[PDB]
Subunit: 461 residues, 4 copies
């Protein structure tokens, strides 16, 4: 009865986990442990999110306060990736001297627990560095002159730094001016929970940048904040965030072992049935377990990166957040496997499998037209439209137009000063919107719907 | 002929109310009284809306005028949930002293019928309360020091309060400063209808809040207005809004009794027919009457809450407005029952009943993907996007993206300073929009349309 | 052969106008004359539009210049239906005195061909009128005190009007202050075409309005411009716009006579065929000619109103523009009749006729839900959302939401200060969007498409 | 066996290029050379785009700096096509004198490598030209008075030009005032790549324009920048962009010869088969090759225009960019031909061919309604809505409304001051949106989908 054994095993392989508890009466660990994964991974993600939100909020608020304190005539919103700009030789001098003078008077201007930090040389002071082209008769070599203005020099009642030869900034040869200083802060919004609060160090840099030499000096403010140790503080669990992460690793490591077992054992079952079929005369490979394995790997990597982040007091979580969020997404998506055996919960996945070939084939022809339109729009409307300035911006604009978004602003944001470009823009926009939206969206939704219809008629036969 | 009786009663149960006037020639109270409900409930809602609009408008305009009078350099729009903000120790002093000095000179600055009210202690004056951390060497206990500045102290020509030790606000230990005062107003826009006008009392509080200790002091203005009695006024129907509400209660109470009778009597008819069916060999439960009962209950509760609100002169109608509006919505929706027997007016409800199982089953699988995307987007794009800052904001953004709204702003509002987060954002957004919109919306509309098609072919057979 | 005659006439009645030129070889006046109508009506509309655009542009630019000249601290954009606002008793005095002083110095401030006009009393001067409640101890009777400030009084070097008792404006009793004056302008942008240019008279009124008595005085500027005769001008065809209008009237009057003939003669043909059908054993009423008759009537009324407007030099064209535009719309729509006989150009009208019953029946049930949602949203979200402030605004917002517009701004523009209203808003918005968009739009498009399918299968059989 | 030869040739004509390598074993030049075209044309377009982006960026930044330097009280954003505006006779004088005085002090105000250029007369100076109506008693002849203010006149310490009779600008007769000057710049952002940098000359013109005579003087700033030769510069490949363009011309010229050969030879094959068919008893014309020929012609013209642009140092690329972008679009679109023989990659083109007749016929009837609505909306809502101001703006707004864009802003941007126009606007907007979106989009998508269905059933039979 080896054929009996083989066919009974094949019957066991395809029955629902509920039915696998009737065929052989065994506990479904790969379902309870997966529910545990969902719960624990979601809790970990939410708690990580809340904590890093607090840290990011503190850093951003301090940066905004720094910009108000040190940038002259700062509205409150950044003009661009740069914060301020100046167009006159006297406005630039005013901005530079304002920054230096506001540094000099920090203790009487700041509304927070700020102080004077220390550079690598361990001195409380300010560094100003200018870059010029060496000398109409200019060379390509950049001269770099730096000065270190200490608080005792700045404090001098008849100040001398203002009349020094360093601050005579020939502007036709000037590339940039940098002001760098260090500040120490204390997060007092944590002390309400009995603890030693977090101490920060801010590496603040102000760049007055005219690399373009086009009349505008762009002013950049960058603050790099790191958590240091509170060396001067007297206020009259990391352990329990490292054991919860260890638990998540344990659950995910177990799920990797169970799922890898199934994938290996499923392949052996296919071998046993293929050999018989050749003797007498994909439904074996489960891609959901391939998804679970990737989820587990990403969760383990994210938990390890998060433990490393907390252990050495880091403040950059972009990679760890990406791993944790993608793992949580994949966990919630893999929940669908435990509703897919159900007789009326699988229309979506079946339709996706049906569609995928036809959908991919369709997107090839539409992709070529989309790429041609992207290149044409970037080359023609790029100088005259801000939704067509960069190739990725053109792609995003075209995708949104296919989804019918900002169609009137896109039409109306082109100026009629050039009539040729305006006419071309009208022709371009009406040809893409018409062609793409109507024809291509019709034929794409129609393919999906006919795949869904084919899936439902098999279900009904 | 007991079977004759039973089958005649079953014929009576399913015929249209117009036909029930031919089978047994009886008045359809449950239709005329329902039309009366529609008319009267809509009139009540509209009149309530107009009156509470007038009251809310007065209160909001007074609040805006208060903000202009007392907040220094107030643009006219709130920055956030807070009204103003300051970043310098001298700006905060200027704001505080400006508020106190503008209170001192209210009679010569206000453009309205304002006056000086009285606190619980029954004295015309101003209260300033500061909160500090008790003392670098700070404790967790918050010291609370308050002063009461009366108009006679403020009026003193060489004022002394400005140089007092209370207003030396150490800012590294400061949590918040509160200014509280009372003002009395008169609504003169009502006197044009011969009456004694409405007298208001405003509990105004200004909070200079730096609980974050991040360099910015947020300034909150809150005005709590209550209607008092006009004790000093000589200007040379509540009854008819309490009898109209009583009429609405009477009509709704009658409708509850009639509809509860039907539901009970319908169950008895089912018993009489089930017993026979077992002898010889839901269409009895009406969910529209279950909706009418809830409508009547909500209308009665709303009318009682509104009568209570007017009787003790309250100015908060959120709960009463919710009850009245939901009752009106349900009344207009239950109007459809009296068009559902019609042979060609019922396609919508029949399609809803057909779809509901399949639609609910479909939304289970799509819901898991939606939740995973919500968590992933909040954890990754939350620090760098304002449409992903909170989990409910992520949900709203994703729902709007499924409906194709603000797709280019969502794509373009992420800064390319971090290239990893930017690339992940692009992948995330294109995967959700593509997957969800195209596949899921196709399969959802297709299910609804096939349910509609099945409903129409039964109608045609 | 009376039956031969009748059936030949019935054959003649339904053949295309091209075929009517073969059956009986007669000129199709009702086609050439209709093409003439299209051309001439469109030319008339375009020319009217251009001329009234010029006039409106002049008037609006003068109004904007008046607002800048006379409104103190005018940004350039109106805050609301009012232009400016003030919150202090000194700001209102400053605004009033600024308006009067800028009137006094008009000849040295204006950048145009402006001058001092004359009131009904024929005096160059300024009128200031204040309204107070007659006198805490205020009455309901409004006292109206007016003063007339002539340029000779204003010109006096030690002015006296500023210290007069008229400008002591008790603000707790004040309703409004009005400043009225007359200015004369000349449109010099017309003189470049040899003519006597257009002379205007501006009735300017500035209202400082505090009818609400809520602390804000709203400032309204209204300028009423009329074209007068140039009595003082020496610059070193109405006939041909009144004969073109007469031609349009003639063409439209002829079309009314021809189309009324057909409608009458068509009814006689129906009588002759109905009588025979009863003897032996709508396709007669043409609704396109009913549309042509309305088009002709509206065109004649619009042309007469436009001739009247030009004849007495009026500057309000809202009614005439409405008539002309609707007539042009209906003319272009009635062009479709002369493509409807074509065998493959009539799918749209046939589908509309098929759908209309079912579409109307469907919109009845959806209309009740829409009205209930409108009332609920206005009553609940009205105080807290500006897209739900008025009932028509609620209707517009709901219609746009059904069309998927501004869904994220609608979700996010509700403040979470009230949690009950916020939760209700979320439930409300997700229930309408879901229900209406998905189910109702599906069932509406499906009805239209099935009507189109039924129309095409008859065409194919 | 001439029939054998003919039928073998006809078999050869329709087999895929891969199969043409089996039938006769020949190299497919028209595929490899087309891939070369794709690669080389895309590289040329991208490189052209990057270079012209750099040039345009420099010119725009210099223009923005010029506006800040010379326009008094310049916010930073243009109000309209004009930059600034003034409403007072003293504001215009201030602006004019500010422009002249900022020109006088350019060397101490500019943040860049700017200098004083020279006019055609070869003198460093400023030209001011005013236009007046010759003289209430004004004539139609425009007097033109000009002055030339040289730096030596401007430099005079007790300046005299300010009190000259030229700057007494009677404003009721004034048409415009022009200030023209020349500046020389150097692009130093190029020197970092060892080269002689680019030298520019700016023809700057400031027009204070009151042609409307409506109280506002519009201020226009226009800067015309051309690349001159660096005559005064000592900084201590065009060849390789002209050989890459020549290569692109060579590849495109070869593709024209090959494709023209096929089109001619295909016609001969049709003749040989038509003659036989008549003896015994479009699939010959390839429109893809007609597209390739146009692509090649446009690419050659664009490359020649770009070589001409670089050869004489031009800075206008609108025509060349249009040619290059359209050629690249058409190249990427013609890539689809080499996926069209594939058995499941041609659904899109087949559906387009099927649909096109029906789609064109449908758009005729919808076009008439669209044109009527456009005219009606422009004539009625034009004075009161900025999305209906011009006929093309009306068309764009209506197209976006059909695509469901900005529906609430369109509804809400009409003011209720005129109730007739407001009611008409509501009726107009709800009738177009309803009719067009629902009915017309349904019938258009339905036609496309039924064409797709007919194409798929032939494929399956
Ligand atoms: C641990 O046990 P656990 O992994 O939780 O349970 C296994 C799974 O149910 C597996 O089915 P899938 O869920 O589809 O992988 C099944 O084939 C195995 O049967 P078998 O032991 O006879 O091979 C079980 O051992
Ligand atoms: C009060 O009378 P009222 O409630 O207005 O009228 C009743 C309803 O018409 C009910 O039908 P529904 O409208 O479907 O509930 C019907 O079964 C009852 O017949 P019956 O009296 O023989 O039981 C009527 O008495
Ligand atoms: C003027 O002549 P006109 O109105 O231009 O032409 C008439 C129309 O063609 C009419 O058909 P419709 O276009 O459908 O109204 C037709 O029935 C009449 O035939 P009849 O004269 O024998 O009655 C014609 O006289
Ligand atoms: C150069 O040769 P080339 O143009 O690259 O190749 C030609 C094409 O393959 C052409 O088919 P299409 O691609 O459809 O035009 C085919 O008819 C010609 O066969 P023939 O030479 O026997 O006429 C070939 O010579």
């Amino acid at each position: 009865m080896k054929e009996e054994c083989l066919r009974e095993d094949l019957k066991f392989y395809f029955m629902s986990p509920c039915e696998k508890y009737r065929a052989r009466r065994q506990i479904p660990w790969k379902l309870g442990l997966q529910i545990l994964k969902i719960v624990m991974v979601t809790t970990q993600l939410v708690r990580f999110g809340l904590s890093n939100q607090l840290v990011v909020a503190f850093k951003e608020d301090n940066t905004v306060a720094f910009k108000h304190l040190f940038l002259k005539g700062y509205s409150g919103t950044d003009e661009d990736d740069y914060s301020c700009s100046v167009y006159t030789q006297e406005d630039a001098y005013e901005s530079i001297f304002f920054a230096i003078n506001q540094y000099h008077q920090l203790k009487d201007i700041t509304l927070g627990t700020l102080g004077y930090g220390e550079n690598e040389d361990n001195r409380i002071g300010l560094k100003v560095c200018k870059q010029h082209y060496k000398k109409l008769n200019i060379d390509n070599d950049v001269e770099l002159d730096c000065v270190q203005l200490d608080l005792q020099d700045l404090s001098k009642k008849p100040p001398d730094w203002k009349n020094s030869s360093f601050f005579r900034l020939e502007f036709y040869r000037l590339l940039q001016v940098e002001i760098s200083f260090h500040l120490k802060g204390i997060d007092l919004q944590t002390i309400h929970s009995r603890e030693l609060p977090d101490c920060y160090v801010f590496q603040n840099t102000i760049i007055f940048d005219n690399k373009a030499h086009s009349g505008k000096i762009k002013i950049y403010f960058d603050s790099d904040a790191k958590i240091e140790e509170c060396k001067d503080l007297n206020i009259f669990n990391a352990q329990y965030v490292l054991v919860f992460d260890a638990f998540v690793i344990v659950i995910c490591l177990a799920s990797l072992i169970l799922c890898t077992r199934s994938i290996v054992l499923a392949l052996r079952l296919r071998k046993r049935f293929l050999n018989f079929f050749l003797e007498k005369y994909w439904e074996f490979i489960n891609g959901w377990y391939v998804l679970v394995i990737i989820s587990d790997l990403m969760t383990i990597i994210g938990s390890i990166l998060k433990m490393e982040i907390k252990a050495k007091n880091l403040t950059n979580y972009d990679l760890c957040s990406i791993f944790l969020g993608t793992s949580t997404l994949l966990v919630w998506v893999g929940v669908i496997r435990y509703l897919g055996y159900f007789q009326a919960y699988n229309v979506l996945i079946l339709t996706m499998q049906a569609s995928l070939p036809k959908v991919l084939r369709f997107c090839a022809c539409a992709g070529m037209i989309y790429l041609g339109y992207t290149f044409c729009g970037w080359i023609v409307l790029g100088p005259y439209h801000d939704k067509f300035e960069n190739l990725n911006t053109v792609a995003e604009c075209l995708f949104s137009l296919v989804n019918g978004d900002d169609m009137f602003a896109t039409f109306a944001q082109i100026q009629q000063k050039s009539i040729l470009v305006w006419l071309f823009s009208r022709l371009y926009l009406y040809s893409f919107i018409s062609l793409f939206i109507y024809m291509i969206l019709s034929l794409f939704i129609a393919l999906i719907t006919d795949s869904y219809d084919t899936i439902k008629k098999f279900q009904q036969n």
